[PDB]
Amino acid sequence: TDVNECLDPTTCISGNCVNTPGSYICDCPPDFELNPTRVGCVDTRSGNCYLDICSNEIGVGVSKASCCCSLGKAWGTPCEMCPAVNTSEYKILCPGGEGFRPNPITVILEDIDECQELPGLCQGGKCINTFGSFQCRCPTGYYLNEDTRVCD
C-alpha cells in the first residue's frame, strides 16, 4: 500500500513512471515504445546511420541507438540528428553511455557491434569489435582517414 515504485531508480528505463496502486505505468517519450515486459522504452525503428549532418553512410537498417550511441552523427529518413552527448535526450536513448544500447526485447544494455552494424566506420579496413568500442586496422600501404573513416 505505501509503495511508489517511481521512487526506485531502476523503474522505467528511458521512460516516465506513473505510480498506480499495486504497480506502475511507464510512459515512453516520442519515438520510443514500451518493451514486451513493460520495464522500459526502446526505439525499434530501423534507418541508415550517417557520419555527417545526412551523408557518409556507415550502416544500413540499424536502430537509432546503435547508430547514435556509437559514432553515428545522424540517422533515418528523413534524417534525424543524433542527440548531443550532454542532453536529456541522449540520456534516454543511450542509458549506458557511449558504446552500448538496450536490447530491444529485454532493455538490458549490450555492446554495439560496430563491425556488424556500422561497417562504414572502417571502410577498406579490418574491424575488430570490442566491449564498448572497436578497432580499425587499415591494410598495408593505406591509412585511416580519421574524418571519413575510410582507409585512405
Rounded to a whole number of angstroms, the minimum distance from the CB of residue 104 to Ca ion is 17
Q: Residues 111, 127, 136, 138: which binds Ca ion (CB under 5 A)?
A: 111
* Least gap, CB of 68 to Ca ion (angstroms): 14
Exposed, middle or buried by CB within 10 Å (0-12, 13-18, 19+), for 65?
Answer: buried
Q: Using CB under 5 A, count the residues that bind Ca ion.
A: 3
98 near Ca ion, judged by CB under 5 A: no
- Beta partners for residue 91, in sequence order: none
Distance from C-alpha of 83 to C-alpha of 56, rounded to nearest angstrom:
18
* Residue 95, phi then psi, degrees to nearest 5: -70, -10
Q: Rule CB under 5 A: which of 54-83 touch Ca ion?
A: none
d(CA 38, CA 49): 28
Closer of 57 and 111 to Ca ion (Cβ): 111
Q: Which residue number, 12 or 123, has a Cβ lying nearer to Ca ion?
A: 123
